[PDB]
Design a protein around this ligand. Structure first.
Ligand code: HEM
Length: 154
């Protein structure tokens, strides 16, 4: 699948807003993920034991993870589809070290979309959301292909 330049512009335009507060958005997203799909919290050894949203908000490790996710994703989105190099080490660690099924990447995509909608309503109308969904689908499709090469496809 291929995004048009106009769809990339919509994606990179909200993303410039996200980057004003990387740590805050990373928290919101990972908390949304863990509340909506608690099975995902089990994958994170530093943070599995957290019981409430208040504990989550307080956690420095959760905040570090959030910043790590959003910084890596940002770097991918700014490639506008030319992201083969960036994807290789990410696919390898998530397939063979962490063991993250594709389904979980769908869940975090849903969390990203929810949080951008809440925090950026003026820059995240229907066409911008469509374009973000297309960019994240492209990311997932390319990761799934790499999982398969690596021997996992989960
Ligand atoms: C937008 C998608 C995602 C991005 C860009 C991303 C990126 C990263 C990065 C850059 C790291 C550190 C380097 C590495 O281990 O490769 C990491 C670690 C990790 N990721 Fe992700 N990730 C994503 C989604 C997920 C999801 C959905 C899960 C689990 C439900 C997950 C679980 C983990 C775990 C367990 C670690 C290791 C954390 C630790 O240090 O204990 N990732 N991820």
């Amino acid at each position: 699948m291929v995004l048009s330049e106009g769809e990339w512009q919509l994606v990179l335009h909200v993303w410039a807003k996200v980057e004003a507060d990387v740590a805050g958005h990373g928290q919101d997203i990972l908390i949304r993920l863990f509340k909506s799909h608690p099975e995902t919290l089990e994958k994170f050894d530093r943070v599995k034991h957290l019981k409430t949203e208040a504990e989550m908000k307080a956690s420095e490790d959760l905040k570090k993870h959030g910043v790590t996710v959003l910084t890596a994703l940002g770097a991918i989105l700014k490639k506008k589809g030319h992201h083969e190099a960036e994807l290789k080490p990410l696919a390898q660690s998530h397939a063979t070290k962490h063991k993250i099924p594709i389904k979980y990447l769908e869940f975090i995509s849903e969390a990203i979309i929810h949080v951008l909608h809440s925090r950026h309503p003026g820059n995240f109308g229907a066409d911008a959301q469509g374009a973000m969904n297309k960019a994240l689908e492209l990311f997932r499709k390319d990761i799934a292909a790499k999982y398969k090469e690596l021997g996992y496809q989960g």
